[PDB]
């Protein structure tokens, strides 16, 4: 029960790419508009 | 990337949170200075 029941209709007599399957998750290359609050210094009181 | 911690800042938005003190989650990213080395030209061709 941790799975899809119906992959596909009979025709096309072929599994379509749009249906979701089992496989890799994470390690995907991926954002935009994330605000910088503070630029700091390593050289105390940061 | 390092780890993330929350910070407190005063909102400046008339939202109901105007002039109030909001906690926010915040990632620290460690960035020691990047040393410049080379330089690369690029011709623009009809291929790319």
């Amino acid at each position: 029960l941790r799975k899809i029941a119906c992959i596909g209709a009979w025709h096309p007599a072929r599994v379509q790419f749009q249906v979701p399957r089992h496989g890799q998750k994470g390690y995907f290359h991926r954002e935009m508009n994330k605000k910088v609050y503070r630029v700091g210094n390593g050289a105390p009181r940061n | 990337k390092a780890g993330m911690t929350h910070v407190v800042r005063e909102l400046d938005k008339g939202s109901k949170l105007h002039k109030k003190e909001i906690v926010e989650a915040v990632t620290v990213v460690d960035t020691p200075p990047m040393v410049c080395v080379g330089v690369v030209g690029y011709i623009e061709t009809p291929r790319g």
């Binding site: 072929r14 379509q16 790419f17 | 009809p46």
Partner: protein, 200 residues
Amino acid sequence: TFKKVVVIDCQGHLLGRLASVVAKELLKGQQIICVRCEDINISGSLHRNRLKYQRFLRLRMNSNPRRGPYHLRAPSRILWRTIRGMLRHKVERGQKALARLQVYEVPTMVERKKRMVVPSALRIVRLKPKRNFCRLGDLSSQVGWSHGDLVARLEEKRKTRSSAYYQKKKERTKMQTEAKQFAQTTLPKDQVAFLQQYGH
């Protein structure tokens, strides 16, 4: 019964009419370059041809469209398809014909060589005037071919390059045909009248 290479200028040319000539010559064993493929023409208006290219993008393998009809946006790559459309390309002989063909949207290399013209497959000849036509460079840049304005720049650059070559040659076409008129006098008067029978 044929030359080593035959470079085609493809401006003024109609797309199918060109391709059908070019196909049969590849089968006869002639090796061909096509050049300035962006300027090649098609009958019908721009809107009409783009509506026909949109019917082509609608086609795809529904299972996995990675696999299916590759929609090729570049003018060089578009002409290449319609030549392959006029060849039995699954058979081994058909494949050999494509191998001969080289298509470019003008590089280095063959600016230095002459470009010929197929006269039957030509717009000023064929399309009865008023009847609206469309350039392939426009049709391709409508459908996501990015490199319109480079092929503007590079051509406009190497036209100035070629007009510098022209005025050297045009000066030393004068210079030979000046020295011809001396040489035609000094050799004896029988053989001057001999050449004016046969044109030279």
